[PDB]
Design a protein around this ligand. Structure first.
Ligand SMILES: [Zn+2]
Length: 29
């Protein structure tokens, strides 16, 4: 996993999965 959510320790292997996960820790709306 080159992409790991530091906040909630949820790592991903998809750069976009982590990107969508980024947008859920930082709400777009
Ligand atoms: Zn997270």
């Amino acid at each position: 996993k080159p992409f790991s959510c530091r906040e909630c320790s949820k790592a991903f292997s998809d750069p976009a999965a982590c990107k969508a996960h980024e947008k859920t820790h930082s709400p777009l709306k």
